Design a protein that fits this description.
The chain has 155 residues and is mainly beta. It has helices at 22-25, 123-135; strands spanning 8-17, 33-38, 44-50, 56-64, 70-73, 82-90, 94-100, 110-116, 143-145. It has one domain (1-155): Lipocalin. It is built from 2 helices and 9 strands, in the order E-H-E-E-E-E-E-E-E-H-E. An 8-stranded antiparallel barrel has the order 1-2-3-4-5-6-7-8. It comes from Mus musculus (Mouse).
């Protein structure tokens, strides 16, 4: 994993989870544009522009986790820490991320995220994503391919 090659513009195209938050705000989520650039500690700054209630921007800081392609993230839409890993990536096409956390014994969710350099997604990729998600205890009702906002991602 060459972190430098993973900088620049990405589109979030796939999301698979079992979190409470996702189990509800699911239908409401669209594809977001995420620009990746270095963080202070040698990690990654993720600046995303997304559609929320018909246009917003937030920055998430991925702190380095001791090995290349491994990171941690603080409290997103919930209040926990996330262990993020790059399952597989082609810096010119896509990246399959896996995030895991736990609010405590018997309280552990998983989140699979598929980022893409383009807004269109090839079936082969959808399948890879489908497969990974199903190996991690997620089913179809968990897997969602984010809609292309006809707005808050180009402008």
């Amino acid at each position: 994993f060459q972190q430098d090659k993973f900088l620049g513009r990405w589109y979030s195209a796939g999301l698979a989870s079992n979190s409470s938050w996702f189990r509800e705000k699911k239908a409401v989520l669209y594809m977001a544009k995420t620009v990746v650039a270095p963080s202070t500690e040698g990690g990654l700054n993720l600046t995303s522009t997304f559609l929320r209630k018909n246009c917003e921007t937030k920055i998430m800081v991925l702190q380095p986790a001791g090995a290349p392609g491994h990171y941690t993230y603080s409290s997103p839409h919930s209040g926990s820490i996330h262990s993020v890993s790059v399952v597989e990536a082609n810096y010119d096409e896509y990246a399959l991320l896996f995030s895991r956390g736990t609010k405590g014994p018997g309280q552990d969710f998983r989140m699979a995220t598929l980022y893409s350099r383009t807004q269109t997604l090839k079936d082969e990729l959808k399948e890879k994503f489908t497969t990974f998600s199903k190996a991690q205890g997620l089913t179809e009702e968990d897997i969602v391919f984010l809609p292309q906002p006809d707005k808050c991602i180009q402008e």
